[PDB]
Design a protein around this nucleic acid. Structure first.
Lengths: 149, 113, 147, 134, 132, 187
RNA sequence: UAGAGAGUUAAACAGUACGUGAAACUGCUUAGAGGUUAAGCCCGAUGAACCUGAAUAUCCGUUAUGGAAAAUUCAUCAUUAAAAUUGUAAUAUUUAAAUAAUAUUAUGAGAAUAGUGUGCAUUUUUUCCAUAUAAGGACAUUGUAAUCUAUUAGCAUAUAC
RNA sequence: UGAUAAAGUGCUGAUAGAUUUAUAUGAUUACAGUGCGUUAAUUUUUCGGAAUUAUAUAAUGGCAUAAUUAUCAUUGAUUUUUGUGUUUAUUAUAUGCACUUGUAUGAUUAACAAUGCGAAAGAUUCAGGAUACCUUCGGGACCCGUCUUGAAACACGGACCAAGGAGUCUAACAUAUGUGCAAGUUAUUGGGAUAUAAACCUAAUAGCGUAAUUAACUUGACUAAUAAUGGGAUUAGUUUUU
RNA sequence: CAUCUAGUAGCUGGUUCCUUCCGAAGUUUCCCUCAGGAUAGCUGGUGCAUAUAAAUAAUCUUAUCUGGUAAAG
RNA sequence: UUGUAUACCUAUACAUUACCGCUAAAGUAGAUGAUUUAUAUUACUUGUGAUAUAAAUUUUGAAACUUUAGUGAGUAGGAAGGUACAAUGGUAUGCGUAGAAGUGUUUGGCGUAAGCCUGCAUGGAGCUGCCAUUGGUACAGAUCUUGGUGGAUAGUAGCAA
C-alpha cells in the first residue's frame, strides 16, 4: 500500500553499506533496547526533551473515576450561538422582548466560564456550576444564572 | 602578496584591457561590451559614464566614481603570458614574480592581452 | 481511476440527481448534510479570461525584439568595431595615416634627387601629384583673405 | 467543467489517443481530428468546436473531404447526425487548397489543414504519377 | 532517397565506442554493461590513467541530433497500419520501424501504405517471404 | 579552479504547486500571465502564495475578516485570502463584505451571503481587480499551529516554555525530576 | 547395445540428457598471428574482412515564349438549390433586473458545396514538356580564395624621453 | 650612439575554429557605402578622369591678454570656473528620392572550381565505422571486494558458471508534503438498503480538538456588543490617502 | 536427541540499477563509559520572509582598550 | 658543481571556441476576419495613415517553447530524475501458428548511461506500449546456498603386506 519505488531501499541498490557507513555500520542494538538506560548513557536525551521523567509527585488515587471530574465547560464567548440563528439580531431592533432561557445541561455543558466579551442583552443561563466572572458579566447586563441541576 | 603581482598601468594598458578583454556586469551576468549601450545603460543615470573612454577615464585618472567604474567590470580573465613566467614563488625583486613589479606590469600585460 | 465513462441514464434516474446530490442553493435530501463541492474557479475558461478587456487594458507591452546578440569583436585588429565604440579613434587614425602618407612623399622625393625622372604616373603618381597640389593650397592663403 | 483548458489538463497525460513513443519526448496523439498528430493543447479531440479534421476521401482516391469545426448550433452534444458538418473540396491541387483557405476565413488551424490536405492529395498522387518504371 | 529530412544536419558523435564494466573481461559472469564501481580502492572509480573510462554527462549528444539515426530521422515504432498514418505529417522528421512481432501477412500492408504516405521505413524487406 | 559553490546557489523556493488539482493550476496559468504582464507585486504575492502548502496557508476566521475590515477609508474593498475562510460563531453580526478565497467554508458562505456580500474566486477577482486595487490581502497566523509550540526544547534557559512530546496528561507524566524543585531541580 | 541406409511425422535439432535447450568447459572446422606486463586492458591509429550514409535543377530568376490535354458547380461572371459559420434581432430556459450561456426561430453581408447556361478552351482555369541569362549549378568529398574570433612568427614609417 | 614608452604605426607570412531548423510562435533591424544630381574659379595626368578653394552653425585646440579659483615653491611655476577678441589650426552637423551580388548577417562563413549520375531488380564514387574479433605499432597500464591513518600487498575472501540470495511487515509517535471537510472532524464497533468480502445509507456513542492549572482541594482566562496579543518597533500590499 | 529457538551479540562478514547535484567526521560534555552510545558540532533535504538603500554581513585602514611571550634584566 | 644568458619542451591549470549538464536570471501566450510582410485604391504633407483586393508562419506535451550568463573533484552520507523485473486497475477498435515468450548471433542502430529497438537463425502459444497503484522488484563477493563444470591429470598420485 505504501510505495517502495520512492523508498530508499530502491536507491541504495547497489551501494555497499545501504546508508550506514563503512565504519560503524548497522549493528543490532548499540545503546540498548527502548528507554534504557535513561539515567546513564542516555541521560542528556532524557533531560533535555523530557524533564520530569524519573521521579514521583504524589497522591495515589487507587481507582480514579473520571466521571467525577467530568464538567464540560462553555465560555460567554460563544453562548449566543446556542440560541438559534436569527434571534441573534432579531431582538436588537431595539426591543428587549427576550432573555433567552438557556439550559446548558440540555446542551451537554455543566459549567459556564467567562472569557466572553459578551453583548448587552439579558440572558437566563442555567448551568450547574458557576464561574464568578460569568455571573458578574451576566448580572451586569440584566441576566441570571439559575443554579440548577 | 605571494599569490599576486601588481604594478602601475599605462594608459595603453588601460585601453587594451577594456577594449580586448573588458566584460561588464549586467544584473549579475557577464556581458561582453560590443557597443557603448552596455556601459551607458547602467552608468549614465547615476554616474556620468556612457562611452568606453568614459570608463577608461575614471579608471586611469582615478575619478570620483572609480568605485563604480571598476566594480562594473568583471575581473579581467587574462590569458597566460607568452614566454611565460619567471619563478612564481619568489618576489619580483628576488628573481622574479609576485608582488609589485611596478612598471613592468605593462610588459606583462602585453603578453596577457 | 480515470474519468469519462459513457453513462446512459434513464429519466427517473435523472430526476433523482437533485435529491442525491444537493443543488447549488440548497443541500441534499438523501445524503444528509451534503453540499455540492465548490470549485476553486467559477469561470474556468482561460481563453475568455486572457482576452478579455478588463485584463487586457492593464497589461504592459510584449516589447518584442529578441536580443540573440552575441559576438565580441576585437577592437584592436578591427577598426569598424573600434570606430564604433570610440569615435575619435577615427580622427587620429586618419590624422596619423594622412601624415604617414605625407612622410612618404618627402622621402621618395628626397631620395630621387639622384634620378629625378618623372613627374608622371608610375612611381611618382603617389609622389609628384601631391608635390604639385601645394599649388592647390596656394589658393587658401591668397583667395581666402577676402573675408 | 465547460472549458477546454480544464478539459485538457484532465486528459493531457492520459487519454485513449496519447501515443508516448519512447524517446523524442512528446510528439504524438492519434485522435481523429488532430491535423498534426502531437497532443499540443488544442490540436486535439474535443476543443468544443474548432475541431478541424482534414481527411480522405470519401471516395478513395478522390479528394480532401474536410470534417469542419462542428460549430455552435448543436450543443456540442454529438451526432446521430447533429453536431458535425463535413464539407469536401475536389478537382485540383491549387483550386481546392484555395477553397479550403477560403472556407476558413478565420485563421488559426488553417495551415495545419493546408498541409494535411496537401499531403492527402500527394498520398493519392501515385495512382496518376510515378508510373511503370521501365 | 525517400523523403530525407528537412535540410539535414551533420551529426557529431562524442565517442562511438560503448562503455565496458570494469573487470568484465576477466570474468564470464560480468557483462560489459556499465556498473559504477563503488569499491573503496577501485582505480577506475578514482579515475586513474590508463583505465576504462566512466560515463559522465559531458559525453552527451547534441540536442539537435540526439536520437537521430544515421539517415537523418528519429525513429517511430509502427505496430499496425493505423499507427503508420500518424506519420502522414511527420515524414520529414521520422522514420518508421515495423515492430518485430508484426507478421509477414500484415507487414505487406505497412510497406505498401508507406510508399503512398512516403514514410521511409528502417526495416523494409524483413520477414518476407519474397514470393507468392 | 575558481571559488566556491555550495549553497544556496540552488534556491529552495517553489516554482510550481506540488498539487495536481486542475482548478488550482488554471489559476497559476492566469497569474503567471497577470504577474508577467502587469508587474504588480499584488499578483506576485497571489502567484507565490498559490504555490504554497497547507501550512503557510492557514485558515482565517469570519471574525478576523470582519475586523480587519475596520480599515479606514476602505468601505468598498475586497478581502483576499489565498487560503480558507472559516466561520466564527463568536461573531454575532456579519458585516457586508467582499471575500475572495480558495475555499470559503460552507457556513461562512451563508453568513457572508445573508448579510449580503460577495464570495469570489481568484478569476472573479482577476476581472474585477487585475492589479489588486480595492483589496485587503490577508493571511492567517502561521504559527498558530500546535506543532509550533513544540519547537524546541532544552531546559536551561528562561526562554524555554516549549512543550514536550508526551502521551498522556496528569502526574506520572513528566512532572517530577526537572519540573519540580523538590525533585532534582527546576529546569 | 549399435552404426549406415531407409521409414513415420508438420518436425526427429521431437527417438526416452524425448518441450525449449543458456553459461561455465572444450573436440573439430575456418581465418590471422606467436622469445617481447604471464595474459587480459586503455587511448590513438592500422592491414584484412564486413558495414553505413550521401545531388531532385540555374547566374547577377520555383524563365520568356511555344505545345499538349481535360472540368463542362468551377471557367470571370450570372443563376439556382441546399448545409453550416460569423454578426444583428426576438422568444422560452437557467441565474429572479439587466448580464451571460443554452435551445427554438427569423435577418443581413461575405464565403464555400452541388446543379445549368456570352463561353464550354471568347483571349482565361486546372495539368504536363523542349526552348535564355551566368550553368549541369543542387548534393556530398576535396582544392582554392576572402572574411570574422581566438593565436604564432617576422619585418620596419616616424615621434617622445 | 643604446634603453624605455607611445601612435590599427603600417606590412608580411602562417594555425585552429565558423552556433547558426532568419518565427516547427515575432519585423533582415538600423548603420554605412556605391549609382543621375544647380555651380564658379584654381590646378592636374590629359581617359570614362582626379584633386583643391569658395556655404552657414556649433565646438575644440594653438596663440595674445584680462579676470577668477587654489596650490610644489615662489625671480616664478602649476591649477579650477571664465570672459572676450586677437587669432591661427582641427573635428561635428546641415546627404533627400529610387536602385544595387558592399557591416552587425544582429555566437555571420560563405563563394569559384574539380571528382562522382542515388541503375526498372541489382553497380559505382566519396567519406565514415574497436560491430565481436583478428593483424600491426607507440603511449598508458599492479587485483578486485573489504576493515584501515595507510592495500598491489608477504591482511582476509574469491578456481569457474547458472539459478537463489540480505533494510521488510506491523504497533505507536514525529516532522514534512498531498487531499477532503473545517469549530469542528472522523460511518468503519454495529445496523440498514441491496447488485456482492466491494459499493451505498445511517442512529446513538466515542476518540481527538475546541480550557487550562494545581500534589490535592478549590478554582478557571479584564468592562472588544467595537481593538488578532493590548501597546510599541520592523513592517510586503491596499480605488487607500495627500 | 527434539523443542523453547529465527535465544542474544557494543563483534566479524556480506548487503544487488544508472546518471545528476550538494558534501562530512575522527572533536565537546556525560555515561561500570575506553571496539559502544546519548549530546553538541560538522551534512543534506525542505521551505519560508525579503527579483520587468542609509539592508546589512565579513579580511584591512582609523580610534580605543587589553596582554606579560620573544627580546631585555 | 657555483653564478648567469637566450631559445625551446611540458599538465586535466589558464584563454578562446564547439557540445552536454547544472545553476541563476529573462521573455512569449487578443487565432473572430489576432498579428505581421510584400504589393495594389484614397484622405492628403512632401509623407504617413485608413478601407479594399493579391501568399504564407503560428492551437509552443502553459510539465512547452525562446533568450542570456556562469559553472563541473568526491568516500561516508543525503537528495532529484532516469532505467531493468513481476503484478493489479484502466487503456491502446494493440501484436500473434502468415510464428508469441525464450535463446543464439561480425544484422543495422539509438541512448552520457542503466538499457532499448531491429534483422536473421532456432523455437512452438502466448505476449507488449501507455496512465495509475504496487511488490517476495535489479547481485560478483557473504570460508554465501543448491547444482553443474575446468585445470591439476589419462598422469613421477596411484592400483607394491
Amino acid at each position: 500500500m505504501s510505495n517502495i519505488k520512492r523508498k530508499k531501499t530502491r536507491k541504495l541498490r547497489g551501494h555497499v553499506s545501504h546508508g550506514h557507513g563503512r565504519i560503524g555500520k548497522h549493528r543490532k542494538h548499540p545503546g540498548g533496547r527502548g528507554n534504557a538506560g535513561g539515567m546513564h548513557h542516555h541521560r542528556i536525551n532524557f533531560d533535555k526533551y523530557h524533564p520530569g521523567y524519573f521521579g514521583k509527585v504524589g497522591m495515589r488515587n487507587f481507582h480514579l473515576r473520571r466521571q467525577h471530574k467530568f464538567r464540560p465547560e462553555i465560555n460567554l464567548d460563544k453562548l449566543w450561538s446556542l440560541v438559534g440563528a436569527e434571534k441573534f439580531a432579531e431582538l436588537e431592533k431595539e426591543k428587549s422582548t427576550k432573555a433567552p432561557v438557556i439550559d446548558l445541561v440540555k446542551f451537554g455543558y455543566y459549567k459556564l466560564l467567562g472569557r466572553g466579551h459578551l453583548p448587552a442583552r439579558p440572558v437566563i443561563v442555567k448551568a450547574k456550576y458557576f464561574s464568578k466572572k460569568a455571573e458578574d458579566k451576566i448580572k451586569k447586563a440584566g441576566g441570571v444564572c439559575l443554579l440548577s441541576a | 602578496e605571494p599569490y599576486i603581482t601588481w604594478g602601475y598601468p599605462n594608459l595603453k594598458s588601460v585601453r587594451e584591457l577594456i577594449y580586448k578583454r573588458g566584460f561588464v556586469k549586467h544584473n549579475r551576468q557577464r556581458v561582453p561590451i560590443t557597443d557603448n549601450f552596455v556601459i551607458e545603460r547602467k552608468l549614465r543615470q547615476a554616474h556620468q559614464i556612457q562611452c568606453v573612454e568614459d570608463l577608461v577615464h575614471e579608471i586611469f585618472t582615478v575619478g570620483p566614481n572609480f568605485k563604480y567604474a571598476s566594480n562594473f567590470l568583471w575581473p579581467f580573465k587574462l590569458n597566460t603570458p607568452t614566454g611565460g613566467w619567471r619563478k612564481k614563488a619568489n618576489h619580483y625583486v628576488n628573481g622574479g614574480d609576485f608582488g609589485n613589479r611596478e612598471d613592468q606590469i605593462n610588459r606583462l600585460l602585453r603578453k596577457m592581452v | 481511476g480515470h474519468v469519462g465513462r459513457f453513462v446512459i441514464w434513464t429519466e427517473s434516474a435523472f430526476a433523482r440527481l437533485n435529491d442525491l446530490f444537493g443543488t447549488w442553493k440548497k443541500p441534499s435530501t438523501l445524503k444528509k448534510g451534503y453540499n455540492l463541492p465548490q470549485p476553486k474557479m467559477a469561470n474556468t475558461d482561460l481563453s475568455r479570461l486572457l482576452k478579455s478587456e478588463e485584463i487586457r487594458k492593464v497589461l504592459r507591452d510584449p516589447r518584442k525584439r529578441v536580443f540573440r546578440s552575441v559576438r565580441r569583436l576585437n577592437p584592436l585588429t578591427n577598426v569598424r568595431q573600434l570606430i564604433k565604440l570610440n569615435p575619435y579613434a577615427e580622427v587620429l587614425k586618419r590624422r596619423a595615416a594622412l601624415a604617414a602618407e605625407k612622410r612618404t612623399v618627402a622621402k621618395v622625393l628626397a631620395k630621387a634627387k639622384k634620378q629625378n625622372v618623372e613627374l608622371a604616373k608610375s612611381h611618382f603618381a603617389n609622389v609628384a601629384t601631391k608635390a604639385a597640389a601645394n599649388r592647390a593650397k596656394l589658393l587658401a592663403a591668397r583667395k581666402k583673405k577676402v573675408a | 467543467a465547460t472549458s477546454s483548458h480544464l478539459n485538457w489538463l484532465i486528459i493531457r497525460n492520459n487519454n485513449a489517443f496519447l501515443l508516448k513513443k519512447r524517446d523524442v519526448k512528446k510528439p504524438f496523439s492519434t485522435e481523429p481530428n488532430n491535423l498534426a498528430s502531437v497532443s499540443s493543447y488544442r490540436y486535439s479531440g474535443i476543443v468544443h468546436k474548432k475541431t478541424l479534421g482534414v481527411v480522405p476521401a470519401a471516395d478513395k482516391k478522390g479528394f480532401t473531404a474536410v470534417l469542419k469545426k462542428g460549430k455552435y448550433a448543436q450543443r456540442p452534444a454529438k451526432n446521430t447526425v447533429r453536431v458535425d458538418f463535413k464539407a469536401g473540396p475536389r478537382r485540383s491541387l491549387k483550386k481546392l487548397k484555395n477553397l479550403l483557405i477560403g472556407s476558413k476565413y478565420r485563421k488559426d488551424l488553417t495551415q495545419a489543414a493546408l498541409r494535411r490536405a496537401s499531403a492527402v492529395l500527394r498520398s493519392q498522387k501515385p495512382a496518376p504519377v510515378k508510373g511503370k518504371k521501365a | 532517397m525517400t523523403i530525407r529530412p528537412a535540410y539535414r544536419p551533420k551529426i557529431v558523435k562524442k565517442r562511438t565506442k560503448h562503455f565496458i564494466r570494469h573487470q568484465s573481461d576477466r570474468y564470464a559472469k560480468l557483462s560489459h554493461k556499465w556498473r559504477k564501481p563503488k569499491g573503496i580502492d577501485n582505480r577506475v572509480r578514482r579515475r586513474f590513467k590508463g583505465q576504462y573510462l566512466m560515463p559522465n554527462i559531458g559525453y552527451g549528444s547534441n540536442k539537435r541530433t540526439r536520437h537521430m539515426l544515421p539517415t537523418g530521422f528519429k525513429k517511430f515504432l509502427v505496430h499496425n497500419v493505423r499507427e503508420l498514418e500518424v506519420l502522414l505529417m511527420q515524414n520529414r522528421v521520422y522514420c518508421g520501424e515495423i515492430a518485430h512481432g508484426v507478421s509477414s501477412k500484415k507487414r505487406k500492408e505497412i510497406v505498401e501504405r508507406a510508399k503512398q504516405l512516403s514514410v521511409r521505413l528502417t526495416n523494409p524487406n524483413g520477414r518476407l517471404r519474397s514470393q507468392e | 579552479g575558481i571559488d566556491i559553490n555550495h549553497k544556496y546557489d540552488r534556491k529552495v523556493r517553489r516554482t510550481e504547486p506540488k498539487s495536481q488539482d486542475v482548478y488550482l493550476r488554471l489559476l497559476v496559468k492566469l497569474y503567471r500571465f497577470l504577474q508577467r504582464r502587469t508587474n504588480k507585486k499584488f499578483n506576485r504575492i497571489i502567484l507565490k502564495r498559490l504555490f504554497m502548502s497547507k501550512i503557510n496557508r492557514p485558515p482565517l476566521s469570519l471574525q478576523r475578516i470582519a475586523r480587519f475590515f475596520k480599515a479606514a477609508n476602505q468601505p468598498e474593498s475586497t478581502i483576499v485570502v489565498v487560503g480558507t475562510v472559516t466561520d466564527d460563531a463568536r461573531l454575532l453580526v456579519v458585516p457586508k463584505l467582499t471575500v475572495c478565497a480558495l475555499h470559503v467554508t460552507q457556513t461562512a458562505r451563508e453568513r457572508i451571503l445573508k448579510a449580503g456580500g460577495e464570495v469570489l474566486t481568484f478569476d472573479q477577482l482577476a476581472l474585477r481587480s487585475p492589479t489588486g486595487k480595492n483589496t485587503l490581502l490577508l493571511q492567517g497566523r502561521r504559527t498558530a499551529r500546535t506543532a509550533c509550540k513544540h519547537f524546541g526544547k532544552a531546559p536551561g534557559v528562561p526562554h524555554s516554555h516549549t512543550r514536550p512530546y508526551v502521551r498522556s496528561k496528569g502526574r506520572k507524566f513528566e512532572r517530577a525530576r526537572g519540573r519540580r524543585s523538590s525533585c532534582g531541580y527546576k529546569k
